[PDB]
Amino acid sequence: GKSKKWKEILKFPHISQCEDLRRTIDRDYCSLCDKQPIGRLLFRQFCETRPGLECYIQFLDSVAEYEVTPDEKLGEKGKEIMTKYLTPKSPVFIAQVGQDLVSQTEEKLLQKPCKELFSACAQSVHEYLRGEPFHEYLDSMFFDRFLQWKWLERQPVTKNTFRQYRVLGKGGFGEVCACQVRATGKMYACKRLEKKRIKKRKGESMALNEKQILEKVNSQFVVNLAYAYETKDALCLVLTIMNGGDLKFHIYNMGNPGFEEERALFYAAEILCGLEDLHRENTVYRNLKPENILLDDYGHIRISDLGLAVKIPEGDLIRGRVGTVGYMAPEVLNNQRYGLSPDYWGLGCLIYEMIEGQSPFRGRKEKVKREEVDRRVLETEEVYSHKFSEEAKSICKMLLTKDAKQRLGCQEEGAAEVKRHPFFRNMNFKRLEAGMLDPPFVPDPRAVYLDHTDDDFYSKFSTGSVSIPWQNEMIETECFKELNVFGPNGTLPPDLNRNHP
Template sequence: MAYITGTDLAEGEEAETGMGAVSCRQGQHTRVAAPRKQGGNIQGSWSLGWKCLWSEMGPIRSGLEELWELRGHQCLQPKSLEPAPLLEKPLSEWPVPQFINLFLPEFPLRPIRGQQHLKILGLVAKGSFGTVLKVLDCARKCVFALKVVPKVKVLQRNTLRQCKEEINIQRHISHPFIHSLGDSWQGKRHLFIMCSYYSTDLYSLWSAVGCFPELSIRLFAAELVLVLCYLHDLGIIHRDVKMENILLDERGHLKLTDFGLSRHLPRGAQAYTICGTLQYMAPEVLSGGPYNHAADWWSLGVLLFSLATGKFPVAAERDHVAMLANVTHCDSEIPASLNQELSLLLHELLCQNPLHRLRYLHQFQTHPFFRGVAFDPELLQKQPADFVMETQVTQPNPLEFMPFKDFDCDLESFLANLIHA
């Protein structure tokens, strides 16, 4: 499994960064998070996390402000009634004030004793925003992937609203080709997101075999088309469609995962922040917007191009400015050796103008590349994925078992000591 991070800024909102663990297999994929500038200063410091938290308090905040105002008339020194100076103190370590629990109802409180039925089997991925663990639910005798995010980093990096958005989206979507949410909760130190565990992702498979046969490309493309149309119809833009975020189930069919950068974007609305993985980002995203759901279709084009040719249409660059300069010439890079129907599909997905990009289900249903394909999840799942099953690879697990009694301890220090032991 792989999780990535990035930044999202909608009009009238504060910067929010998708929480998650960054895959250890970064290779040539560069992840960026470029907050918008205001008055020459880049937002994203620890103080913004507190501001975001304060803005989420709603009625509780207004009640406190009313109380402070009342007390101010009765007190000779109103300065003593100002909010605690903790707002001005860098938040670099535990403890996080207990009242943060009030503003994350999406993560129910769960005591330590309620987590004792989980055993850590291994480390899936670790990044700057959190850790993904392979865990065994002893009660259900089932293996899950558990994403663990420190609350301190949620506040430091101003990701509170995006944490809520990620969970809200995952709780309201259900599709055969989407990695569904299993459970979520919080302790004193961490937020926890648990999903089904799959041992292989599309990037691992692609790294092992290179080019995919056209039959497999057509099957994956049809499944992803159904997923993206489903999300877009709900007003959700994923913003991080890439091979690392596509898991493969036991039958070789895909599960789109990691909604850390996703957000609700109604039809006609636009986004502006540069976020995601550089090599998959549409030109309108790289340029700072405005952009909309059409950006996901560009990412699909990059993914299919890579599966068909064994390489990316544009080499990775150090930043989004250099990447944009290269992507501008992307439409001339499709190899002439590709099947004519597949080449046409890639041209229509990797179209510089998002208005001319393929983006509706009926356009794919009538496309020459998908001739004879039934765009029905149940029928697609019945199609054999022999190539995938024969070549699936499982990442070696350096940590077969880690004795772990308290998931809410200093997880990062524990893992660091264990890995380097």
């Protein structure tokens, strides 16, 4: 769905145009060879040229496959990796691992197969690439090509960069549309924030807060921010598109009054991962409700509606009675200094409501006032049914602990405490986070489930494209493969040769 002249829009600039990028970018290994997708691919492509570095890339790949290998096939994958990479005579043999650490891997294999077997060897392969191989790549043509990709990334994002279609949406500040990137054709979701409604409502702080939080988090289970630009009539937020309806619709309208045990476990697992990724940024969500868990095209879920979120400084608490009736934790209802605990309360509400088919403190039939719901949350102990297994009951009443100090996941450990819970005894999060596991429900594709002031913050908001989502977009749409073309037989293409502009 790309424009007819898309190859001109994303045309590489001459390497001479990237001299100010070269002098400011930080030469960090993890950022330029891993975190950034296009940067990662280029370093890998650099290691593919030199033959001595080829095996190290093949090795790390086979390690990634082992971490997600089914628990049973771990023993088989362990011997395959050994006989190929960790045997001196073999052709592709990583040497910088050391003769001692390979003998250690042999004992680990003999004492049962653990998913973290080669974790020690992988960290040894990286520590080697961080040195000479990385600095050679920094001088190689591939890094020059990376600079050209950064030059495109940081280009101005305006209205003419997209192709607004029409879809559902009408939030507190505006509406939502289906914007498509013209040069790449990738579908997105545009969240228009009208200009006038923000100034009179003193929303500049909550809109900028929502934008910064949306870009500062990159998780497969939370709506990501790809672009943030301004137009002559509103402020746009380009977010991930979710065409599989929301979770509230599927709990009640779709399926039976609820979900099955196992089905709810899957959605609970990905929500738990989404919260973990937010909590690595010490950012609390506080708005965990069924209709804010959207499904994508393949059946997976993402947490959306991060406007009610806030970033908590490490080692500090925040106060605020905000949220939705029935989904507010007692410490929030009482308006106390809380941290991340309200999100694990809401998680209990989500697990309960998916398995039973109603809120833990508000029946689906009950016409109760907003005060009685708050009373149950603070005083009443929820009851369970034969729909909950013994483990399902546990994780709920542990996540629904009135005292936030003893609530599951609200300890020093964090989300790791919840993944161990016997309720997730059969969930392989190593495989869930890699998309290896299949969702339980697949949405059918065809289914349709002024003034001079304030100009200061308008530029603080309209920051342009986001780095990692933009590089992913180029890879998914296959713009990277088609454009990332060098000269024949390892030769500098015209755009990477300085002798002729």
